[PDB]
Design a binder for this molecule. Structure first.
Ligand code: PLA
Length: 412
């Protein structure tokens, strides 16, 4: 009897956020509510394909001049240019000086992967897998997984969330920067921090930038929610743009999954800013090799939609309107969920619910409370106490606020 070559493969733990989408879908209880994955939902609790996207899909579908031939390894040129322009702004001195590069990627995740793979080979030496990599405490789980997979052995965290203050621990963060070895890589959330929903103010960003510049720390921005932090694309990109004006060289992993609602078309872009043009050229050539052995070349549908919307003043205007619409609904739900919790006179303060920005809220519930909420009330969320505000609708608001109350009460 010959045994199987897969006999010893262990059962892996499940990617939780996707594990719950499954549990939710198949859960038969009617009063179930998915406050899990960070995807927008209308007030009717439905996915929303943006009107502008619908528009363009139709145009693309009626364009017979378009073929399916392979795209360049680095991706659709028009897309890479518009994506980078969106984050840096058209008046960017970096764009003017041609020291900006863009690599089309598979969502923000793919962009993060490509940048980590490049750094692990050409940054701070050759194949230097030892440069420390810093992620916020807490942060999006996949930050660790992505950098670990790229080979970095030393992943550290910088203090960010202050539990006994329910906000940003600036001194902690600043202290961690001061103490970070020179050349260390810092993974920064450009805006709408995940999972806290707490971002530094421009004044704090200035302090953060000041230490980074002094200690030659590398800013690797994750920008997955441009436009959600406030509803304004220009505003949500200010930090990245400030670093650029300060002369930093940096990476910016861009995702169009949430702001274009193109979740399943995997549209991402890795923007690179260098001190001089010649370097962008050499960098992209190394990036081509990395891409070639990962996905060979990127898919066209998503990039085509984003490219057409961003290069047509009319589609662009319209898109900015749809974005603001989503952001506005998140602001509306924050005020409501807070009201109800106060009316129910729920133990403790809950101002933070309206203080945090973006799609998420770091509620503050112990895990035992989350288990109660998921098992008893069928209100799916993460163990950490993070909730997707978009999951709230004028309907289920009371059920949730009730459940959160009962929890806090007969659970604490
Ligand atoms: C901070 C951050 N960066 C990158 C990504 C990846 O975006 P992509 O889909 O373009 O690769 C996410 C997505 N976070 C989600 C919305 C989903 C997930 O975990 O993948 C979340 O629920 O946190 C994110 O929250």
């Amino acid at each position: 009897a010959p045994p199987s070559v897969f006999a010893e493969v262990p059962q892996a733990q499940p990617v939780l956020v996707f594990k719950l989408i499954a549990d939710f879908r198949e859960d038969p209880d009617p009063r179930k509510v998915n406050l899990g994955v960070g995807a927008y939902r209308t007030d009717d609790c439905q996915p929303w394909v943006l009107p502008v996207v619908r528009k363009v899909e139709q145009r693309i579908a009626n364009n017979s001049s378009l073929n399916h031939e392979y795209l360049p390894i680095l991706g659709l040129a028009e897309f890479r240019t518009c994506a980078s322009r969106l984050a840096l702004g058209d008046d960017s001195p970096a764009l003017q000086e041609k020291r900006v590069g863009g690599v089309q990627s598979l969502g923000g995740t793919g962009a993060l992967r490509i940048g980590a793979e490049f750094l692990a080979r050409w940054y701070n030496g050759t194949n230097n897998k030892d440069t420390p990599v810093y992620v916020s405490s807490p942060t999006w789980e996949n930050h660790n997984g992505v950098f670990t997979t790229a080979g970095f052995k030393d992943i550290r965290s910088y203090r960010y969330w202050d539990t006994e203050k329910r906000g940003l621990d600036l001194q902690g963060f600043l202290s961690d920067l001061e103490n970070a070895p020179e050349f260390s890589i810092f993974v920064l959330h450009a805006c709408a921090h995940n999972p806290t929903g707490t971002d530094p103010t421009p004044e704090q960003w200035k302090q953060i930038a000041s230490v980074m510049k002094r200690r030659f720390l590398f800013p690797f921005f994750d920008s997955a929610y441009q436009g959600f932090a406030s509803g304004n694309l220009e505003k949500d990109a200010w930090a990245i743009r400030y670093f650029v004006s300060e002369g930093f060289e940096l990476f910016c992993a861009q995702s169009f999954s949430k702001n274009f609602g193109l979740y399943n078309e995997r549209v991402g872009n890795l923007t690179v800013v260098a001190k001089e043009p010649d370097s962008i050229l050499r960098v992209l050539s190394q990036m081509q090799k990395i891409v070639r052995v990962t996905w060979s070349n990127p898919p066209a549908q998503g990039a085509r939609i984003v490219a057409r919307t961003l290069s047509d003043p009319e589609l662009f205007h319209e898109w900015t309107g749809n974005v603001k619409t989503m952001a506005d609904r998140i602001l509306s739900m924050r005020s409501e969920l807070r009201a109800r919790l106060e009316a129910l006179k729920t133990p403790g303060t809950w101002n933070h619910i309206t203080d945090q920005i973006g799609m998420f809220s770091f509620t503050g519930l112990n895990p035992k409370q989350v288990e109660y909420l998921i098992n008893q009330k069928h209100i799916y969320l993460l163990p950490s106490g993070r909730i997707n505000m978009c999951g709230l609708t004028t309907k289920n608001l009371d059920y949730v606020a009730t459940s959160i109350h009962e929890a806090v009460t007969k659970i604490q």
